[PDB]
């Protein structure tokens, strides 16, 4: 940390040291400077991870605003759902037959979508109401009295 942050001071210190050292060797050092500095991949990994941690601690600042907007949208959709619930639960207060009729229509629509699907459906032959002696045949009609 000190070396990189104070690279100039270390550079001038080593300049003085090298010139005084080589002076006895009759060698004038016109200019002494540092050309490259590299560390083990682990130290550089650590510093990069420090930078990425700072970046993520900053990114949380945008995550919170995204959360704010999502909260607003959630409240809007929930207002819609609450109004729908109050305006539709009063209808089914008397007799919820519409739910059964809607269920039948949804079964028909699901059949329409499945017919062209790519799954492997395994329905139950009871869907074909072909077994006319099963003692469940009169269940639906028996329920009407």
């Amino acid at each position: 940390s000190q070396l990189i942050t104070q690279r100039a001071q270390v550079s001038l210190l080593i300049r003085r040291e090298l010139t005084e050292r080589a002076k006895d060797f009759s060698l004038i050092l016109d200019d002494v400077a540092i050309t490259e500095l590299s560390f083990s991949r682990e130290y550089t990994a650590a510093v990069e991870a420090k930078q990425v941690a700072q970046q993520e601690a900053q990114r949380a600042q945008f995550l919170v605003e995204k959360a704010k907007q999502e909260q607003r949208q959630k409240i809007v959709q929930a207002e819609g759902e609450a109004e729908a619930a109050k305006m539709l639960g009063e209808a089914l207060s008397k007799n919820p037959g519409y739910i059964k009729l809607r269920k039948i229509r949804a079964a028909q629509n699901i059949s329409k979508t499945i017919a062209t699907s790519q799954n492997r459906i395994y329905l139950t032959a009871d869907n074909l109401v072909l077994n006319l002696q099963d003692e469940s045949f009169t269940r639906g009609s028996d329920s009407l009295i």
Partner: protein, 144 residues
């Protein structure tokens, strides 16, 4: 080589990428003055000294992209909430339609049994058995 490298390294070690980008005039003045001073000793005039190609690390590019996308997300969400409001309107409308349908059917069914449900069950059984009658991947196993 030596003078250029030393001048650039000394100039840049003073600050960081954010400070480097924010004040181009400061870094330009520093590099120009330092290079002129260094070349004064070596007697080489610098007709023009200009740094003109800046490229940072991927980390700072990602940080800048996050900073920009924050404001862009704000701008786009300002309209996404409007879209959600319109969807809430169009869902209250559908809820009103369904509620009116349920009101009609409940009024007609409370007083008059629910035979229509059974008749529609038979009709839907026929219709579904026809609809699935072409798919080759539908199998009918026996009840239990």
């Amino acid at each position: 080589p030596s003078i250029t490298t030393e001048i650039l390294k000394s100039v840049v070690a003073r600050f960081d990428a954010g400070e480097l980008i924010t004040q181009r005039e400061l870094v330009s003045r520093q590099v120009s003055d330092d290079l002129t001073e260094r070349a004064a000793t070596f007697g080489l005039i610098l007709d023009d000294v200009s740094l003109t190609h800046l490229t940072f690390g991927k980390e700072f590019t990602e940080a800048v992209e996050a900073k920009q996308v924050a404001q862009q997300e704000a701008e786009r969400a300002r309209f996404v909430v409007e879209k959600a409001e319109q969807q809430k309107k169009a869902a209250i409308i559908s809820a009103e339609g369904d509620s009116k349908a349920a009101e009609l059917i409940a009024n007609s069914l409370a007083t008059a049994g629910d035979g229509l449900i059974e008749l529609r069950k038979l009709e839907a059984a026929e219709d579904i058995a026809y609809q699935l009658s072409r798919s080759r991947n539908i199998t009918y196993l026996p009840a239990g």
